[PDB]
């Protein structure tokens with residue numbers, strides 16, 4: 001019986017279990033979920049994706065049910081789109097005929113054009129890091145106009161989904177909580193769902209209603225994971241983007257804001273990475289391999305291609321925003337992206353108390369060189385994306401949301417600033433000696449701190465990074481649009497400063513991550 005194998009495999013893996021238990025409640029995470037996924041895949045000879053195992057809507061019973069369903073026999077797959085066993089993927093593989101039904105595609109070019117006034121916005125990924133502040137930014141604009149923000153969140157039912165979303169605004173900041181509750185009760189609608197499933201995992205009546213009522217879609221949701229392979233991210237990030245596009249191409253046209261990533265530039269020559277070019281020409285072929293964030297980069301690229309196809313077929317207006325590292329909120333306390341690579345690094349440096357002399361390549365004489373960290377704080381990013389996205393009722397344009405300043409503000413300045421603020425971090429001169437001692441210290445930390453540390457991403461720091469000031473990639477469409485729209489206090493992309501970095505240490509203490 002399938003549930004028995006599911007139970008026993010979980011017990012053996014995690015050192016324990018009830019069929020109503022959730023994998024994460026038993027000590028599971030996204031990486032032990034990969035081990036679990038591969039184990040069950042080999043036993044039952046069916047796909048058992050990580051997403052099925054880790055979804056907040058699913059328990060072990062749900063995993064067993066998924067296996068039973070697959071064993072007795074229609075969604076797009078890696079195999080049906082790219083060909084089974086393929087180690088390279090092409091933009092030409094990703095055609096809309098393989099994701100959307102013929103009737104939707106035939107009717108799409110003649111659909112009514114976008115509404116002149118945006119009153120209702122559908123937002124994906126709202127309980128995520130960036131999405132929560134995109135939700136807030138839309139609520140601030142729309143509530144005073146009698147408008148609505150609808151949000152799809154994973155959960156067992158609408159009540160559980162709402163609870164998950166509410167909890168991300170509880171971080172020890174009274175002003176944040178008050179502001180959220182004020183706006184949410186007036187303008188927020190929360191639906192349990194899943195954008196990798198048909199009809200976005202919704203009740204049919206809700207999906208039909210959204211096809212009629214929604215004026216604009218903000219697609220911020222994705223499985224953001226730097227270790228998982230492309231096959232595991234295909235469902236949430238590629239099929240998911242196609243499901244969002246389907247809604248945008250039903251009943252009437254709905255402009256789409258799509259979140260992407262600097263990782264789509266991997267494998268492309270910086271001079272050839274055209275910020276506002278056609279992504280199908282810029283990156284026509286990509287390889288699947290063991291490189292850092294390869295699967296993630298590929299998955300987000302694939303979504304861009306599909307949306308570009310949707311624009312060319314139906315004139316669907318799209319704005320893509322390729323993010324760098326989206327850093328902490330500069331006002332709201334306890335608000336930082338806890339699982340991101342940067343937060344993990346800062347936490348690890350504070351916890352271990354040791355940093356290298358430089359994170360970057362030394363010069364010929366062994367001296368520290370000028371370097372830049374490609375990061376933008378979320379409060380700026382959320383305002384920029386919302387403003388520029390609202391202006392995107394026509395055409396297709398892309399933005400590189402990277403920090404282009406040749407300001408010499410990088411990881412070594414951040415360590416200096418933490419030391420000047422009173423945090424004991426000693427400098428180890430040899431990078432390879434630091435990296436070795438850093439790893440040892442990390443393994444000696446208590447389990448909670450070690451899991452929150454940079455340990456599972458340490459392979460990104462195998463070599464010192466190149467000493468680059470500014471960004472290698474084009475940023476001029478983003479920078480100039482941000483200057484013209486006069487965004488924030490800067491009327492420009494911000495510089496990262498001492499206040500922001502010291503706030504990381506304060507937020508880490510406030511959340512009890514230590």
Ligand SMILES: *P(=O)(O)OCC(C)(C)[C@@H](O)C(=O)NCCC(=O)NCCS
Pocket residue numbers: 029030031224225226227228261324325326339340341342456457
């Ligand atoms: P799992 O969810 O336990 O996976 C652990 C992880 C370290 C692999 C995962 O948290 C991860 O990939 N973190 C980095 C996320 C990140 O840096 N996001 C923002 C830049 S795209």
